[PDB]
Chain length 332, copies 3
């Protein structure tokens, strides 16, 4: 059974088919690719865009989405095997996945890491559990990667440059400030999709500590090697933004500090200047700027940049809807 866990599991031709079909849905939003069909959207963390775009996407295609929130309405779910379940979890993912399998045609899941031990978070236990026990296709709605955002971001870029071939473009994935440490998911996904598109990627971040998990650095290299692009890690703002075509900001907690965020506080606080403002954007090749959102103004990016005509954040958010309808349609 084919799932949509990461874009890395898909061939360039399959992904390309997805984007084109997404572009097709954007011109003809109503359809019947999901008539009488339904999808279970399971959320273990908040969401505005993902929840809304999927719920609407399923409706516009003749289907119906059932939104579940383990712990708020549905029963909390246990993921570990061979365990005496006398704790806070009343049922196991093995049952939950098989049960949903008899009701819905697709299962979407959102589960951010717990931030206590990256060794445990990097395993993607939730997504992998669903994909293992579910008799129906599973869709990643963001765990430690955000593949749906990738395709929304990618489509938005091609649309901006009026071409599907983004090779030779200078892509800058910059870390940005935030009072607290966040998920690396969106970053791992951006690095993955930008290198898969074959762009000249620079991972701008404060210190080596902030470099993404090796897994994605490796996926990125394999992508560069295959698409003819390039990868590069920079700790210098100006040399990074210089002549950039795209600038994607996202804040995240330094991996080496999982479970020990105390000393991480004083470190991130001394890099607030990483904020994406006009100065840095002026150094770009009239480049574009985006963010997966939700975005904090005057923290991650200044008001002037968000309101700038060069900001394609709203278009990227919109394509989430089209891109996901292409995925669901392709999975049923």
């Amino acid at each position: 059974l084919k799932h949509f866990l990461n874009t890395q599991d898909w061939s360039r031709a399959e992904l390309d088919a997805l984007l084109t079909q997404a572009a097709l849905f954007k011109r003809n939003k109503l359809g019947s690719e999901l008539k009488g069909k339904s999808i279970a959207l399971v959320f273990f963390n908040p969401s505005m865009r993902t929840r809304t775009s999927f719920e609407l996407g399923a409706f516009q295609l003749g289907g119906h989405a059932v939104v579940l929130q383990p712990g708020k309405d549905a029963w909390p779910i246990e993921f570990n095997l061979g365990t005496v379940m006398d704790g806070d979890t009343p049922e196991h993912i093995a049952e939950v996945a098989r049960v949903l399998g008899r009701y819905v045609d697709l299962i979407g899941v959102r589960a951010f890491p717990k931030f206590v031990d990256w060794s445990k978070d990097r395993e993607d236990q939730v997504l992998k559990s669903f994909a293992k026990y579910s008799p129906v296709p599973v869709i990643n709605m963001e765990t430690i990667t955000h593949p749906c955002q990738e395709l929304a971001h990618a489509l938005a870029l091609q649309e901006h440059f009026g071409t599907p071939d983004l090779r030779g473009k200078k892509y800058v994935l910059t870390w940005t400030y935030h009072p607290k440490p966040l998920n690396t998911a969106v970053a791992n996904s951006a690095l993955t999709i930008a290198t898969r598109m074959g762009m000249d990627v620079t991972l701008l971040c404060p210190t080596p500590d902030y470099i993404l998990d090796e897994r994605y650095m490796d996926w990125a290299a394999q992508n560069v090697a295959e698409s003819g692009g390039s990868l590069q890690v920079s700790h210098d703002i100006d040399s990074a933004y210089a002549g950039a075509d795209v600038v994607y900001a996202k804040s995240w907690g330094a991996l080496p500090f999982f479970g020990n965020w105390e000393p991480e506080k004083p470190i991130r606080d001394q890099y607030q200047h990483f904020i994406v403002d006009e100065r840095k954007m002026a150094l770009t090749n009239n480049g574009v700027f985006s963010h997966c959102l939700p975005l904090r103004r005057n923290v991650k990016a200044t008001d002037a940049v968000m309101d700038s005509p060069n900001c394609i954040a709203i278009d990227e958010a919109e394509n989430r809807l089209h891109v996901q309808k292409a995925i669901m349609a392709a999975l049923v």
Copy 2:
């Protein structure tokens, strides 16, 4: 772009068209005025009637409603401008409104005041923010006014008297008891719609402190002046109910006590007799009684009154469904 923020922004002819179309939907509930269309219902406070009537109204018209609750599922939203967003709000209404604008065709919003400073609450920051940044029509689901209730209430009255012309009817908007201070919204809306219908309106309330904000007292005067009705403030129960045709109860916190409810407690507690019971209703001209609901029995009104055949509360609640389908249909 035309919105439905308050009935005061609409002409008498437009409002009349709304009520008639609502009466038309009441005879033919299923339609296609919203086929393939959707609406984002954003709730910052609880709701049973509004949430249900809108969700159903959108369905019965071929559309789909997406219910969002900032803080429970969607991300909390910031409304102030030029602020360093390092607080509890992860994203700004400027983005949220533009994003929803790419997904849904209509946006409904519910946001009661915070009760700390009426000077800030009376500004209607949430509703105005949505209407400012949203590329699609916005609908007031209750903030400091409850226009949807107004039209449901109005339709219910015309239906009761078998006529659209309510002029010359004695309308009594009475304050009523409640262990705590509430929103003036429903009251401000009742005063507005009753004076706009050209009835003889009396605002019965305990003391001058309980008189509604000048804004609505002024809207009411302009309405009297235009419809030929009348406005009047009374602190005497019997002289108010006397020969009334309609009696609308609603409890609210004295505006001058926002942020300082301590001394408000002892004041409201000495006016529990304002409860709408049989005695007061007997003094009426066999008048009708209603309440926007949720209503607390034996506090706001006695069981005998609620169960009375003169109580049209349930019909008013029902018309919410028809009246809102007329608004959505008119806005797309």
Copy 3:
């Protein structure tokens, strides 16, 4: 007006019609028995299966389900009569039921007991209040009985044995361990449906204290007397499982300990061996095993049993969907 509060209120012919229609829906899931229709699903407790199966069932039949959760989104609801509502409940079920009555065509309700006083819980105040004030058919989504589970369980059994006639089968309803005391609902329902099907029922439980409320023991006797089956209470594991055809596990708090669970703790803890493992299942006549779910692994049943080909828990969960579509279709 006909409701679906308990299977006991329905004749054997009506119930049989329900199961057959459920079997019919299972072959033809999409229909129009609910076109333009809607149902209000009111939840006072968590739910994954019930909420999902009903929401989907309504969709697959052309209708729409509105999920309400008094206290989370909708306003909390008061059920006592002639009370001064100055507490935590803003509105009364008399209004809530009549209001929903003007919006939806059906009302489903879930409300577990409070576990403080069984004398009050056994009254089924919530379900009875809805059925009393609602102008439209009411459906029990589990209170002190779980009739929907009954029919899902029953259908799953007939399907397993390839016949609708379950008479002469040895049915074992066994209590099982759980760190805390639970609702007897599923148990009361199993005892009811198994005796109504005319099987040889044994209620295996630790001590006499754990025997179900007399009401259901009585319903069971009347059912035995009518169907030709049998009822029997056993406190011995091996004599119970011996040659069983069906084994239904469910944990519950000893009724005589409501409001006084302290001493109940040490009592249930000394019966953990009641867990449904392979040994006990080996003593059966190659019997089947099920559980209403959510089920805690290695507490209520071992992993080996849940994963066993003899476990029909997932099928029972699926039939919830078909069985409820048959009920809704029959009630409109």
